[PDB]
Coordinates of C-alpha atoms and ligand atoms in Angstrom, one line a residue:
Chain A
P9 CA -20.4 -21.4 14.5
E10 CA -18.9 -20.8 10.9
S11 CA -16.4 -19.5 13.3
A12 CA -15.7 -23.2 14.0
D13 CA -15.0 -23.6 10.4
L14 CA -12.6 -20.2 10.2
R15 CA -10.7 -21.9 13.2
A16 CA -10.5 -25.3 11.4
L17 CA -8.7 -22.9 8.1
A18 CA -6.5 -21.5 11.0
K19 CA -5.4 -24.8 11.6
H20 CA -5.1 -26.3 8.3
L21 CA -2.5 -23.1 7.1
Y22 CA -0.3 -23.1 10.2
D23 CA 0.0 -26.8 9.9
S24 CA 1.2 -26.5 6.3
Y25 CA 3.1 -23.5 7.4
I26 CA 5.3 -25.7 9.7
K27 CA 6.0 -28.2 7.2
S28 CA 7.0 -25.6 4.5
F29 CA 9.3 -23.5 5.7
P30 CA 12.2 -25.0 8.2
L31 CA 13.0 -21.9 9.9
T32 CA 10.3 -20.7 11.6
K33 CA 9.8 -17.2 13.5
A34 CA 9.6 -19.4 17.3
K35 CA 12.5 -21.0 16.1
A36 CA 14.3 -17.6 15.4
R37 CA 13.2 -15.7 18.0
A38 CA 14.6 -18.5 20.5
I39 CA 18.0 -18.9 18.7
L40 CA 17.9 -14.9 19.1
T41 CA 17.1 -14.7 22.8
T42 CA 20.5 -20.9 24.9
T43 CA 23.7 -23.0 24.3
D44 CA 23.2 -25.9 22.0
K45 CA 21.4 -22.9 19.4
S46 CA 23.6 -20.3 19.4
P47 CA 24.3 -18.9 16.0
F48 CA 27.7 -17.7 14.7
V49 CA 28.2 -14.0 13.9
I50 CA 29.3 -12.4 10.8
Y51 CA 30.6 -9.2 11.6
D52 CA 33.5 -8.5 9.3
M53 CA 35.8 -10.1 6.3
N54 CA 37.4 -12.4 8.3
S55 CA 34.7 -13.5 10.7
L56 CA 33.0 -14.5 7.1
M57 CA 35.8 -16.2 5.8
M58 CA 36.1 -18.1 9.3
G59 CA 32.0 -18.3 9.0
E60 CA 32.7 -20.7 5.9
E61 CA 34.8 -11.0 -4.4
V62 CA 33.2 -10.6 -1.0
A63 CA 29.9 -8.5 -2.1
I64 CA 29.4 -10.7 -4.7
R65 CA 30.3 -14.1 -2.8
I66 CA 27.5 -12.7 -0.1
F67 CA 24.3 -11.4 -3.2
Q68 CA 25.1 -15.2 -5.1
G69 CA 24.9 -16.6 -1.3
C70 CA 21.3 -14.2 -0.7
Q71 CA 20.4 -15.2 -4.5
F72 CA 20.7 -19.0 -3.5
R73 CA 18.4 -18.5 0.0
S74 CA 15.7 -16.3 -2.2
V75 CA 15.3 -19.5 -4.4
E76 CA 15.0 -22.0 -1.7
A77 CA 12.7 -19.6 -0.6
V78 CA 10.2 -19.2 -3.4
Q79 CA 10.6 -23.0 -3.6
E80 CA 9.4 -23.0 0.2
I81 CA 6.6 -20.5 -0.3
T82 CA 5.6 -22.4 -3.7
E83 CA 5.2 -25.8 -1.8
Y84 CA 3.1 -23.4 0.9
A85 CA 0.7 -21.9 -1.6
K86 CA -0.2 -25.2 -2.9
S87 CA -1.7 -26.3 0.7
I88 CA -4.0 -22.7 0.7
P89 CA -7.1 -24.2 -0.4
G90 CA -8.3 -23.1 -4.2
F91 CA -5.3 -22.6 -5.0
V92 CA -4.4 -25.6 -7.4
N93 CA -7.8 -25.4 -8.6
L94 CA -7.4 -21.9 -10.3
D95 CA -6.3 -21.3 -13.9
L96 CA -2.6 -22.1 -14.1
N97 CA -1.6 -19.1 -15.9
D98 CA -2.9 -17.3 -12.7
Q99 CA -1.6 -20.1 -10.2
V100 CA 1.8 -18.6 -11.7
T101 CA 0.9 -15.1 -11.5
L102 CA 0.2 -15.1 -8.1
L103 CA 3.4 -16.7 -7.6
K104 CA 5.3 -14.1 -9.0
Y105 CA 3.9 -11.0 -7.8
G106 CA 3.5 -12.8 -4.1
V107 CA 7.0 -14.0 -3.6
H108 CA 9.0 -10.8 -2.8
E109 CA 6.1 -9.5 -0.4
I110 CA 5.9 -13.1 1.3
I111 CA 10.0 -13.0 1.5
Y112 CA 10.1 -10.3 3.0
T113 CA 7.7 -10.7 5.7
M114 CA 9.1 -13.7 6.7
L115 CA 12.6 -12.2 6.5
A116 CA 11.9 -9.9 9.4
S117 CA 11.3 -13.1 11.8
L118 CA 15.0 -14.0 11.0
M119 CA 15.9 -10.0 12.1
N120 CA 16.1 -7.9 15.3
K121 CA 17.6 -4.2 14.7
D122 CA 21.3 -5.3 14.7
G123 CA 20.9 -8.2 12.4
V124 CA 19.6 -11.4 10.9
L125 CA 20.1 -15.3 10.8
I126 CA 21.1 -17.0 8.0
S127 CA 21.9 -20.7 7.3
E128 CA 19.3 -22.1 9.0
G129 CA 20.3 -19.9 12.1
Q130 CA 23.8 -21.3 12.4
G131 CA 24.7 -18.4 11.0
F132 CA 24.0 -14.2 11.9
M133 CA 25.1 -11.1 9.7
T134 CA 25.3 -7.9 11.1
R135 CA 23.2 -5.1 9.8
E136 CA 26.5 -2.6 9.9
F137 CA 28.9 -5.0 8.3
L138 CA 25.7 -5.4 5.2
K139 CA 25.9 -1.7 5.4
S140 CA 29.2 -1.9 5.0
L141 CA 29.3 -3.5 1.4
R142 CA 30.4 -2.0 -1.6
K143 CA 28.2 0.5 -3.4
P144 CA 25.6 -0.4 -3.9
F145 CA 25.5 -3.8 -2.5
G146 CA 26.1 -1.9 1.0
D147 CA 23.1 -0.6 0.5
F148 CA 20.3 -3.5 -0.6
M149 CA 19.6 -4.8 3.1
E150 CA 18.8 -1.3 5.2
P151 CA 15.0 -0.8 4.3
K152 CA 14.5 -4.5 5.2
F153 CA 15.8 -4.1 8.7
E154 CA 13.6 -0.9 9.0
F155 CA 10.4 -2.7 7.5
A156 CA 11.4 -5.5 10.0
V157 CA 11.9 -3.5 12.9
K158 CA 8.3 -1.9 12.7
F159 CA 6.7 -5.0 11.4
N160 CA 8.3 -7.0 14.6
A161 CA 6.8 -4.3 16.8
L162 CA 3.2 -6.0 15.5
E163 CA 4.1 -9.1 17.6
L164 CA 2.9 -11.6 15.6
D165 CA 3.7 -15.5 15.8
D166 CA 3.7 -18.2 13.2
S167 CA 0.4 -19.2 13.5
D168 CA -0.7 -15.5 12.3
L169 CA 2.0 -15.3 10.0
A170 CA 1.0 -18.5 8.3
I171 CA -2.5 -16.7 7.7
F172 CA -1.6 -13.3 6.0
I173 CA 1.0 -14.8 3.9
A174 CA -2.0 -16.8 2.5
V175 CA -3.9 -13.9 2.3
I176 CA -0.7 -11.9 0.4
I177 CA -0.6 -15.1 -2.2
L178 CA -4.2 -15.1 -3.3
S179 CA -4.2 -10.9 -4.1
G180 CA -6.5 -10.2 -6.9
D181 CA -5.4 -7.4 -7.9
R182 CA -1.9 -8.9 -9.5
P183 CA -1.4 -7.4 -13.3
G184 CA -2.8 -10.2 -15.8
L185 CA -4.7 -12.1 -14.1
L186 CA -7.2 -14.0 -15.8
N187 CA -10.2 -14.8 -13.7
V188 CA -10.3 -12.3 -10.6
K189 CA -13.1 -13.3 -9.3
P190 CA -12.6 -16.7 -7.4
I191 CA -9.2 -15.8 -6.2
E192 CA -10.9 -12.6 -4.5
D193 CA -13.0 -15.6 -2.8
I194 CA -10.5 -17.6 -1.2
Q195 CA -9.0 -14.8 0.3
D196 CA -12.6 -13.1 1.8
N197 CA -12.6 -16.4 3.3
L198 CA -8.7 -16.1 4.3
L199 CA -9.4 -12.8 5.6
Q200 CA -12.1 -13.6 8.1
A201 CA -10.0 -16.5 9.0
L202 CA -7.1 -14.1 9.4
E203 CA -9.2 -11.8 11.4
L204 CA -10.7 -14.1 13.7
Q205 CA -7.5 -15.3 14.6
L206 CA -6.0 -12.3 15.3
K207 CA -8.8 -11.5 17.4
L208 CA -8.5 -14.7 19.6
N209 CA -4.4 -14.3 19.7
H210 CA -3.9 -11.1 20.3
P211 CA -7.5 -9.8 22.2
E212 CA -5.6 -7.1 23.8
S213 CA -4.0 -5.7 20.3
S214 CA -6.5 -3.0 19.4
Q215 CA -7.1 -3.6 15.4
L216 CA -4.0 -5.4 15.1
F217 CA -5.8 -6.8 11.5
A218 CA -5.9 -3.3 10.4
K219 CA -2.5 -2.8 11.2
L220 CA -1.3 -5.9 9.5
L221 CA -3.1 -4.7 6.7
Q222 CA -2.2 -1.3 6.5
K223 CA 1.7 -2.6 6.2
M224 CA 1.3 -3.8 2.9
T225 CA 2.4 -0.1 1.9
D226 CA 5.8 -0.6 3.5
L227 CA 6.3 -4.4 1.5
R228 CA 5.4 -2.8 -1.7
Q229 CA 7.4 0.1 -1.9
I230 CA 10.6 -1.8 -0.7
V231 CA 9.9 -4.7 -4.0
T232 CA 10.0 -1.7 -6.1
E233 CA 13.5 -0.1 -4.4
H234 CA 14.6 -3.5 -4.8
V235 CA 14.2 -3.8 -9.0
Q236 CA 16.3 -0.9 -9.0
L237 CA 18.8 -2.0 -7.5
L238 CA 18.8 -5.0 -9.6
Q239 CA 18.8 -2.9 -13.2
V240 CA 21.8 -0.7 -11.5
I241 CA 23.7 -4.3 -11.0
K242 CA 22.5 -5.5 -14.6
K243 CA 24.7 -3.0 -16.1
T244 CA 27.7 -2.8 -13.9
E245 CA 28.2 -6.3 -13.2
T246 CA 28.1 -7.6 -16.6
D247 CA 30.0 -10.7 -15.8
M248 CA 27.3 -11.5 -13.3
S249 CA 24.3 -13.2 -13.5
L250 CA 20.5 -13.6 -11.9
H251 CA 19.4 -17.0 -11.1
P252 CA 16.7 -18.4 -13.8
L253 CA 13.9 -19.0 -11.6
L254 CA 14.4 -15.3 -10.3
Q255 CA 14.7 -13.9 -13.7
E256 CA 11.0 -15.4 -14.4
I257 CA 9.8 -13.5 -11.5
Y258 CA 11.5 -10.2 -12.2
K259 CA 10.8 -10.4 -15.9
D260 CA 7.3 -7.6 -16.1
Chain B
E2 CA -19.7 2.0 23.7
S3 CA -21.3 0.4 20.0
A4 CA -23.4 3.5 20.3
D5 CA -20.6 5.5 20.7
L6 CA -19.0 4.8 17.6
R7 CA -22.1 5.4 15.7
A8 CA -22.2 9.1 17.5
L9 CA -18.9 9.3 16.3
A10 CA -19.9 8.1 12.5
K11 CA -22.8 10.9 13.0
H12 CA -20.2 14.0 13.8
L13 CA -18.0 13.2 10.9
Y14 CA -20.8 12.6 8.7
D15 CA -22.2 15.9 9.5
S16 CA -18.9 17.9 9.1
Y17 CA -18.0 15.8 6.4
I18 CA -21.4 17.8 4.3
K19 CA -21.0 20.9 6.0
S20 CA -17.1 20.7 4.6
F21 CA -17.8 19.1 1.3
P22 CA -20.0 21.2 -0.9
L23 CA -20.0 18.5 -3.7
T24 CA -20.5 15.3 -2.3
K25 CA -20.7 11.7 -3.9
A26 CA -24.3 11.3 -3.7
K27 CA -24.6 14.9 -5.3
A28 CA -22.1 14.2 -8.0
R29 CA -23.3 10.7 -9.0
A30 CA -26.8 12.1 -9.4
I31 CA -25.0 14.3 -12.1
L32 CA -23.5 11.4 -13.5
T33 CA -26.4 9.4 -14.2
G34 CA -28.8 11.9 -14.8
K35 CA -31.6 14.3 -13.1
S36 CA -27.3 18.7 -16.4
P37 CA -23.9 19.3 -16.9
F38 CA -21.9 20.5 -20.5
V39 CA -19.2 18.1 -21.9
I40 CA -16.2 18.2 -23.0
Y41 CA -14.9 15.4 -25.2
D42 CA -12.6 17.2 -27.7
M43 CA -10.9 20.5 -28.4
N44 CA -14.0 22.6 -29.7
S45 CA -15.8 21.5 -26.8
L46 CA -13.0 22.7 -24.6
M47 CA -12.9 26.0 -26.1
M48 CA -16.4 26.6 -25.9
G49 CA -16.7 25.2 -22.1
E50 CA -14.2 28.1 -21.0
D51 CA -16.5 30.9 -22.5
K52 CA -19.2 29.0 -20.7
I53 CA -18.2 27.7 -17.6
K54 CA -17.0 30.5 -15.2
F55 CA -13.5 28.9 -15.0
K56 CA -11.1 30.8 -12.3
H57 CA -7.8 29.9 -13.5
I58 CA -8.1 31.2 -17.1
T59 CA -4.8 33.5 -16.6
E60 CA -0.5 25.0 -24.6
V61 CA -3.9 23.3 -23.8
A62 CA -2.5 20.5 -21.8
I63 CA -1.0 23.5 -19.8
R64 CA -4.5 25.4 -19.2
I65 CA -6.0 21.8 -18.4
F66 CA -3.2 21.0 -15.8
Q67 CA -3.6 24.5 -14.0
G68 CA -6.7 23.9 -13.7
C69 CA -6.4 20.5 -11.8
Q70 CA -4.0 22.4 -9.7
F71 CA -6.2 25.3 -8.7
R72 CA -9.1 22.8 -7.7
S73 CA -6.6 21.2 -5.9
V74 CA -5.7 24.3 -3.3
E75 CA -9.0 24.4 -3.1
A76 CA -9.5 20.6 -2.0
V77 CA -7.1 21.0 0.3
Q78 CA -8.6 24.1 2.1
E79 CA -11.5 21.9 2.3
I80 CA -10.1 19.1 3.8
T81 CA -7.7 21.3 6.3
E82 CA -11.5 21.9 7.8
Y83 CA -12.8 18.7 7.9
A84 CA -9.8 17.2 9.6
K85 CA -10.3 19.9 12.2
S86 CA -14.1 18.3 12.9
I87 CA -12.1 14.9 13.6
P88 CA -12.0 14.5 17.5
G89 CA -8.9 15.0 19.1
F90 CA -6.9 16.3 15.7
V91 CA -7.2 20.2 16.8
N92 CA -5.7 18.9 20.7
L93 CA -2.6 17.4 18.7
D94 CA 0.7 19.0 18.4
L95 CA 0.6 21.9 15.4
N96 CA 3.7 20.6 13.6
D97 CA 2.4 16.8 14.3
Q98 CA -1.7 18.6 12.2
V99 CA 0.3 20.3 9.9
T100 CA 2.4 16.8 9.0
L101 CA -0.7 15.1 8.9
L102 CA -2.5 17.4 6.7
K103 CA 0.5 17.6 4.2
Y104 CA 1.3 13.7 3.7
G105 CA -2.8 13.1 3.7
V106 CA -4.1 15.9 1.6
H107 CA -2.6 13.8 -1.8
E108 CA -4.5 10.3 -0.7
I109 CA -7.8 12.2 0.2
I110 CA -7.6 14.1 -3.2
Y111 CA -7.7 10.9 -5.1
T112 CA -9.9 9.1 -3.0
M113 CA -12.6 12.2 -3.2
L114 CA -11.9 12.7 -7.1
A115 CA -13.2 9.1 -7.6
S116 CA -16.3 10.2 -6.2
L117 CA -16.7 12.6 -9.7
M118 CA -15.3 10.0 -11.5
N119 CA -16.5 6.7 -13.7
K120 CA -15.0 4.9 -16.6
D121 CA -15.7 7.4 -19.1
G122 CA -14.8 10.8 -17.2
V123 CA -14.9 13.1 -14.2
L124 CA -17.1 16.1 -13.5
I125 CA -15.1 19.5 -12.9
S126 CA -16.0 23.0 -11.9
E127 CA -18.6 21.5 -9.0
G128 CA -20.4 19.5 -11.2
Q129 CA -21.0 22.2 -13.8
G130 CA -19.2 20.2 -16.6
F131 CA -17.4 16.8 -17.3
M132 CA -14.3 16.5 -19.3
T133 CA -14.3 13.0 -21.2
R134 CA -11.7 10.1 -20.2
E135 CA -10.5 9.6 -23.9
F136 CA -10.3 13.6 -24.1
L137 CA -7.7 13.7 -21.4
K138 CA -5.8 10.7 -23.0
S139 CA -5.6 12.8 -25.8
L140 CA -3.0 15.2 -24.9
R141 CA 0.3 15.3 -25.6
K142 CA 2.7 13.4 -23.2
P143 CA 3.5 13.3 -20.8
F144 CA -0.1 14.9 -20.1
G145 CA -2.1 12.4 -21.5
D146 CA -0.9 10.0 -18.9
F147 CA -1.9 11.8 -15.8
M148 CA -5.3 11.1 -15.0
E149 CA -5.7 7.5 -16.4
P150 CA -4.3 6.0 -13.3
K151 CA -6.9 7.7 -11.4
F152 CA -9.3 6.4 -13.6
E153 CA -8.3 3.0 -13.3
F154 CA -8.1 3.3 -9.7
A155 CA -11.6 5.1 -9.2
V156 CA -13.1 2.1 -11.2
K157 CA -11.8 -0.3 -9.0
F158 CA -12.8 1.8 -5.9
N159 CA -16.1 2.8 -7.1
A160 CA -16.8 -1.1 -7.1
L161 CA -16.5 -0.9 -3.4
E162 CA -20.0 1.1 -3.5
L163 CA -19.0 3.4 -0.5
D164 CA -21.6 6.0 0.3
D165 CA -20.8 9.6 1.8
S166 CA -21.4 8.6 5.4
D167 CA -18.9 5.6 4.3
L168 CA -16.5 7.7 3.0
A169 CA -16.1 10.3 6.0
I170 CA -14.8 7.8 8.1
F171 CA -12.5 6.4 5.5
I172 CA -11.1 10.1 4.8
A173 CA -10.5 10.7 8.7
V174 CA -8.6 6.9 8.9
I175 CA -6.3 8.5 6.3
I176 CA -5.5 11.2 7.7
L177 CA -4.5 10.2 11.4
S178 CA -2.0 7.6 10.3
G179 CA 0.9 7.7 12.3
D180 CA 3.6 6.7 9.9
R181 CA 3.7 10.4 8.2
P182 CA 7.6 11.0 8.5
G183 CA 8.6 13.3 11.0
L184 CA 5.7 13.2 13.6
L185 CA 6.9 13.6 16.7
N186 CA 3.8 12.5 19.1
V187 CA 2.6 9.4 17.2
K188 CA 0.9 7.9 20.0
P189 CA -2.7 9.4 20.2
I190 CA -2.6 9.9 16.4
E191 CA -2.6 6.0 16.1
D192 CA -5.3 6.1 19.5
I193 CA -7.4 8.3 17.6
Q194 CA -7.3 6.5 14.4
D195 CA -7.9 3.2 16.3
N196 CA -10.9 5.1 17.3
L197 CA -11.9 6.1 13.9
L198 CA -10.9 2.7 12.6
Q199 CA -13.4 1.1 14.9
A200 CA -15.6 3.6 13.8
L201 CA -15.6 2.3 10.5
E202 CA -15.9 -1.4 10.8
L203 CA -19.3 -0.8 13.1
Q204 CA -20.3 1.9 10.1
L205 CA -19.5 -0.6 7.0
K206 CA -21.3 -3.8 8.6
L207 CA -24.7 -1.6 9.4
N208 CA -24.6 -0.3 6.4
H209 CA -23.1 -2.5 4.1
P210 CA -24.4 -6.3 6.1
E211 CA -24.3 -8.6 2.3
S212 CA -20.6 -7.2 1.5
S213 CA -18.2 -9.7 4.4
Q214 CA -15.0 -8.3 4.3
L215 CA -15.8 -4.8 2.9
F216 CA -13.6 -2.9 5.7
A217 CA -10.1 -5.2 4.4
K218 CA -10.8 -4.6 1.0
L219 CA -11.3 -1.1 2.0
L220 CA -8.1 -0.9 4.0
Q221 CA -6.1 -2.3 0.8
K222 CA -7.1 -0.1 -1.1
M223 CA -5.2 2.7 1.2
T224 CA -2.0 0.6 -0.1
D225 CA -3.3 1.3 -3.6
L226 CA -3.9 5.3 -3.0
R227 CA -0.2 5.5 -1.6
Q228 CA 1.4 3.8 -4.8
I229 CA -1.2 6.3 -6.6
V230 CA 0.4 9.1 -5.0
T231 CA 3.9 7.6 -5.2
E232 CA 4.0 7.5 -8.5
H233 CA 2.0 11.1 -9.2
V234 CA 5.1 13.0 -7.7
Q235 CA 7.4 11.2 -10.3
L236 CA 5.2 12.6 -12.9
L237 CA 4.5 16.0 -11.3
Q238 CA 8.6 16.8 -10.7
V239 CA 8.7 16.5 -14.3
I240 CA 5.7 18.7 -15.5
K241 CA 7.8 21.6 -13.2
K242 CA 10.5 19.9 -15.9
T243 CA 7.9 21.1 -19.1
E244 CA 6.3 24.3 -17.4
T245 CA 9.2 26.6 -18.7
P246 CA 6.1 33.5 -10.5
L247 CA 3.7 34.4 -7.5
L248 CA 1.6 31.6 -9.2
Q249 CA 4.5 29.3 -8.4
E250 CA 4.4 30.1 -4.9
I251 CA 0.4 29.7 -4.7
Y252 CA 1.4 26.4 -6.1
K253 CA 4.4 25.2 -4.8
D254 CA 3.2 21.4 -4.7
Ligands
3E7_22 C1 13.4 -12.5 -4.0 C2 14.1 -11.3 -3.8 C3 15.3 -11.6 -3.8 N1 16.0 -11.8 -2.4 C4 16.3 -10.7 -1.5 O1 16.0 -9.2 -1.8 C5 16.7 -11.0 0.2 C6 17.5 -10.4 0.6 C7 18.3 -10.8 1.6 C8 17.6 -11.9 2.5 C9 16.9 -12.8 1.3 C10 16.5 -14.2 2.3 C11 17.2 -14.0 3.5 N2 17.8 -12.5 3.5 S1 19.4 -12.3 4.7 O2 19.0 -11.0 5.1 O3 18.7 -13.0 5.1 C12 20.9 -12.5 3.9 C13 21.8 -11.5 3.4 C14 22.7 -11.4 2.5 C15 23.5 -12.7 2.4 C16 23.1 -13.5 2.8 C17 23.2 -14.8 2.4 C18 22.6 -16.3 2.4 C19 21.3 -16.2 3.5 C20 20.9 -14.8 3.4 C21 21.6 -13.6 3.1 C22 16.2 -12.0 0.7 C23 16.8 -11.2 -4.4 C24 16.5 -11.1 -6.3 C25 17.5 -10.5 -6.8 C26 19.1 -10.7 -6.3 C27 18.9 -11.2 -5.5 C28 18.0 -11.4 -4.0

C-alpha cells in the first residue's frame, strides 16, 4: 500500500546513513565482539601515551570528534527529504538543537558497559579510565554510559537508527523556529516510517516504537547536564577554548 | 484481543470518572460557556476570597501558592485512588506502588491541569473560579514565573484535542513507568504499561482517525512533562527558601 512508500523512505534513509557515517553500529559491534579488526585499549596513562596535560589532551580530542560528528550529521540531514527545502534559519535551528541528541544516540552504538570505541574503531577507551580524569573532566562521561546501557538494550540496528535520528532532526518543538508546520509534516511521515520499520524489523519487540520515543527524556537530560559541565570549564580553564562550531551550537 | 483492549479502555474511563470530579468535558463546558467567578487583579482576588469558599485560607503571592499546594495534595489522593483501578497495579510490590505514585503524581498533575487551562487562564476551586494568566504573571518574582511554563505546556498539549477517555489511558501509562528510581520489580510494571500502550494506540486510532501520528505526538509530550516537572522542583526548592509546622509536614513535598 502506502506502506510501500514508507519502505522506500526507510530504504532511502538507511542508504544515506551509511554514506554519511563511516562507523556504523554493525561495524562497531563486530569490533566489540575477530583478528584483523581488534582495537588498541587505553585504560591508563601509559596505554594512552603508547596509543599515540592529559585530561585536556583527551577533552580536545573529544572536541575534534564532536566537530567531525556535526559535519557528518549535517550531511545526513540534507538527505532527509524536505529538509533542505525548509527556511534556512530553521534548517540551522534544527541542526543546532538536534546535534547533541544524535551524537549521544549514536555514541551508544560505540559503547558497552566497559568503554567506548574511538579513532574510527582503532582504539578503545575504558569507562573507568574516563571516570578517573581530574574533576570535573572525570565526570563528563558517566551519564552517556548509563544512557547507552539502557538504550543498547532496545537492540536497534543501523536501519532503525537512520530513521530515528531523522525523526530527531525534524523536531518542531525547537526554540525559535519560524515555520513549525512543514517540519511537523516531514516528522509525521518519518514517524510513520519508523513505526513500520520497527514493526517489521523487530516483530517480537512489543511496543518498541513507544520505548524508543520514551528514550527522548534521557537524551534531553544528558544534554542539560553536559552544558552545566561546560559552564564550569569556562570559568576554571580560561586558557582553554571551545571550537567555533561548538561555540555556535551552545549559544542559546 | 482487539476487543480486550477496548474493555480496558472502557474500564479505565469509568474509573477516571469516579476518581476525578472535575473532568475535561466539564471544565471545557465551563470555559467556553454554559458560569465562574473571575480573578484578574488584586481587588477581584480579595472579593473571591469572601465569595468562593477557600479551604486553605489560614503576602498575596504566598496565599496563592499555598492554595495551589492544597489543591495538589487533594489531586494526589485522587490520582492514588485512580491508580488502584489500573489492572495489575495493586498486585505489584507495595514499595513499587509507592514509588510509581511518588514520581508519577507531578506529571499527572500538570497533565490534568492542562484540562483546566486555556491561553488566558485556569479554573480553580472545582471550577467555581477562574484566575487569569495575566494576574498570575503579575505576581512578584519568583511567584510570577511559576504558572507560565504550565500555560505554555497546556497550550501545546490542548492542541492535541484529547478527551477524557483518551486521557484516562494516557495517565495510566504515565503511572506505570518502569524507569522510576528505586523500583524492585520492573518487569510486571513494563508488562502492564505495554498493555496500556496498546490500549492507548487503539483508543486514539478509533477516536481520532484523522490524526495520523497522534500516539507518537502524545508520547513526545511525556518528555515535555518530565522537563516541566524537573524544572518545577528547581523553583519549588527556592520557595522553601522564600517561605521564612504541622502545616509544613502536611505539604512536605
Ligand atoms: C556535542 C557535544 C560535544 N561532545 C560530547 O559531549 C561527547 C563526549 C564523548 C564522545 C563524543 C563523541 C565520541 N565520544 S567518546 O566517548 O567516544 C570520546 C570520549 C573522550 C575522548 C575522545 C577522544 C576522541 C574520540 C572520542 C572520545 C562526544 C562537546 C561539547 C563541548 C565540549 C566537548 C564536547
